Write a protein that binds this ligand. Sequence first.
Ligand SMILES: [Zn+2]
Ligand SMILES: [Zn+2]
Ligand SMILES: [Zn+2]
Ligand SMILES: [Zn+2]
Ligand SMILES: [Zn+2]
Lengths: 97, 155, 252, 150, 114, 209
Amino acid sequence: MSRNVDKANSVLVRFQEQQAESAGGYKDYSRYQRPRNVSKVKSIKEANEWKRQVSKEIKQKSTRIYDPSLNEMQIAELNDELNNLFKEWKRWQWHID
Amino acid sequence: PRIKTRRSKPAPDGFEKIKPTLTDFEIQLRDAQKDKSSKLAAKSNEQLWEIMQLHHQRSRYIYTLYYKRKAISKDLYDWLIKEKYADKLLIAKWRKTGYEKLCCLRCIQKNETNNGSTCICRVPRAQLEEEARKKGTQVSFHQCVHCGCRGCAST
Amino acid sequence: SWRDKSAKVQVKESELPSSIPAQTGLTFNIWYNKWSQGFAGNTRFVSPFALQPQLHSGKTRGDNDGQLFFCLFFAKGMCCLGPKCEYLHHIPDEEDIGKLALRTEVLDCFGREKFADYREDMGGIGSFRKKNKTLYVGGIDGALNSKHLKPAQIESRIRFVFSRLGDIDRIRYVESKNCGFVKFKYQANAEFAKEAMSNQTLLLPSDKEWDDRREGTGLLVKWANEDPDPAAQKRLQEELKLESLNMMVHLI
Amino acid sequence: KNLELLQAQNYSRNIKTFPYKELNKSMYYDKWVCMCRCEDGALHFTQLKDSKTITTITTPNPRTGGEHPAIISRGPCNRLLLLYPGNQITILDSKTNKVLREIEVDSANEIIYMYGHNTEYFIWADNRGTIGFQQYIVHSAKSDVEYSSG
Amino acid sequence: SERKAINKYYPPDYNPLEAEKLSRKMAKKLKTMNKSHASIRLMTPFSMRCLECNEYIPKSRKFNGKKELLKEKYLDSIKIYRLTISCPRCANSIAFRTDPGNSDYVMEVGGVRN
Amino acid sequence: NEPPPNICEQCLGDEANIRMTKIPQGSECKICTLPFTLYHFKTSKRSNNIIKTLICVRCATQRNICQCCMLDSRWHIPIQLRDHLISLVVMTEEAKNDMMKRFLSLKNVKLGGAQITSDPSEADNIVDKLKNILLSFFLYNSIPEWKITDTVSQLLSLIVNHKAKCGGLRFQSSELGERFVSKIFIIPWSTAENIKLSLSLNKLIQLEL
RNA sequence: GUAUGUCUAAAUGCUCUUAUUUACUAACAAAAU
Ligand SMILES: [Zn+2]
Ligand SMILES: [Zn+2]
Ligand SMILES: [Zn+2]
Ligand SMILES: [Zn+2]
Ligand SMILES: [Zn+2]
């Protein structure tokens, strides 16, 4: 399990995380992938967390896309990615509450 | 008390009479000796104070029966002393003049204190009160941080 | 009139004063009392208690002995010592302020060292360099559980909470910034107010979201970074001048 | 003609603990009656089905603010259903002390009934008569009633 | 605390099978582990030119690549891999495949061998 | 070697005997964050709460202040105020930086003004100069609410916006109000024209944002 | 000797597969009869 990722997703760590989730309510919304279809999330806190995560992602995307080699295609691709992120964020701002 | 290990003989004559009085104390002690999650410094201190008081009280009871009331045999008293029940030094202090009402020994360790003196408890309420009156303020101290002893003095 | 109003206080009994931390992290660090191996959680949670001062405020073990400093816990609204507390339980009156006005430079009305530099977030116990009586209120959205209220209503609510807590100089709610500036007469009073209203809900019993006030995040009450718009500045300057004049008079 | 005192304890009268049925090592059901004392961030539950056996189980209280569940009900396999204000339900394993699931029930009305020995689903009910299994809704909320129990 | 640590501490209740099951349940949800292009450190055997900016990355030069499994195996039961690299100057994704028929590699729309 | 503590007369107390303990490198000074000896005294034996020194002697010297009070050694005024007065007749800029503050502390220049305060010559002169220099109901028509409240009390919840200049006092009692009216700056119930105009303008301003 | 750095506003249970590993790390060391 060299290079840290393996360590992170080693069974023991996972178990610990699960335990934390069970007792006290420590989740790491960084750690899990954000769900595709909203309205399968009855809790508000979770939703908020997800929204926050997406915002963070968007910010990250923004930070990188103004790099100096602007003509490279990665940046262009991200522009679409950025849009997608924005859309997701908007969706997360649903009007149930 | 310590634990019996056939070192000293089980007990002298009149222990059966007093035992039920000083066995109430044990229960109290047990209640005291544990995690009262005090969550607060003052509260924590209070339990210690209570414990100290309890310790004092048993000794006083013993002392009272042996010296003042004199209803218990010398041998029995000696045995008690040998055991952890009574405090020997405390008893001695009590027996001496000016120390009869005495919360605990470490309230008269002059070495201990930051200012080279005894605990305030040892000041008779009278004097402190008088001082307060002279000043303008009301009665200043309630109980010391060693042991809860509102007006320990012999007065 | 706190003296003749009551003696007793007993705000939150020592059975239930507080649980110790709130689980961020995986493991609990014994030395810092803070959860470790992770940081996910906005952390600020609403006070379970509050200072309803008219009910609570009272004589203390401190009052009799001649304590200067007021009870932080009382302010927060959770002083389990109550009448046997050594710190004072009332809203800082003028006389009291006057009495501890010598010390009020170095340390707060709670008897705890004011710092030389402000905290970067203006978040707690103000600096001794800059005297202040002026509190930033914030997180009013969060403190009201995202309620669609009128700004005016919010302002009124703020006034109600803060007037009770101390002699007000002046208050401003702002729609654009989404905040509530308050200014007091006495720094001590301001400090007390801050202590009280840290992590407090602005909601009332009559509101429909009273039972879920705990689930939100409380008021973010902090110190005021001075207002830049010019009239205010001018006023401040004038005040300073007046103060200087007073000082001069005292001297001569 | 004779009675004896077996037990005295404090409890939390606002924690609604439903009596759970259970099958004997013989072939009938005993009603177990249950009481909950929520103190110092722990839950304490004194149960009995008769005068011969009184058990008390201790569990931590899952909520970080240490707030009390309104309703508590047993599920299969050491599952404990804990209903919290705002219609939030925590399933806790009573043997491991682990939090298994956190469910937010989708109802503006206060949940007033929650039972777990119905055995893949539990049943809950609104103060307006919404009844759901957890999932599906067998009955919708009425405007003209209020319930406090079930 | 020391790289050759014999036994990692477990909680007093740790049903290992159960734990494993739990992990599995929370592996589909997991971000890492449920993804492709897992990282790797590799030296470049081909010694090739980055097709965009013509940067002549020579033999044995070390990179933090991404190894990903190609689903279409060679023959039957011997896997082949895509091994992503970036050129030092321009950030163009070079990669290559390991077709083991010739005991060597194949370039994959990154650069050219020379 | 160590220099002595600079504690003022009002700081220290009113008595002819005080006992204090010195705690060498006790705490870091608040200004400089640099170890120094804490002196802490109890004033009167029995009077509660200690008075610990919060600053290093050097820093005190530089600012010319009580090591407890944080006030001018001479005039007993907050550093700002004392310095401000001097300026009126230049002020200190404490540099609020981890490293730089320490450096500043170690410098021995008497920062700004302190010199004047120290010397009988200079302080006195400054003082002289200063001397010379010296020698329900809505409410309409800036001043603080604590003054307004006081005024109301004298006359016997009190809302007042300043951008509006519109103070809606609510005693919530018909007795208090009817006493208030008889016992007596426009004050109706729930150059006049000019005033009205100004008020209107204020209202407009309030309402545009 | 398992490198590193920036980046952070405050669906539920179910089971079935194994005589393995898309395993990762190379700082460590390098010869014949
Ligand atoms: Zn004593
Ligand atoms: Zn004592
Ligand atoms: Zn004493
Ligand atoms: Zn208190
Ligand atoms: Zn002083």
